[PDB]
Amino acid sequence: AHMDCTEFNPLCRCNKMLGDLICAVIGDAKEEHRNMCALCCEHPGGFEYSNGPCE
Structure with a gap:
């Protein structure tokens, strides 16, 4: 899911x-x-990542 993103300052x-x-x-x-x-910052329309050793 679209987790915590740098989309800020x-x-x-x-x-x-x-x-x-x-x-x-x-x-x-x-x-x-x-x-x-x-x-x-460099994703298409909001990369879907999930923090954690799952991949």
Whole structure:
């Protein structure tokens, strides 16, 4: 689901891709994302991620 997104002032101002482990899916594109913010800032229409080691 469309969980906590960076959609605010300090947009995906987080690169350090070496920590998080979200579970994002988009119609038919399910993959994990570290920079969950980079997703929220650079997603199509609101990537569907679910924070947690599920993917």
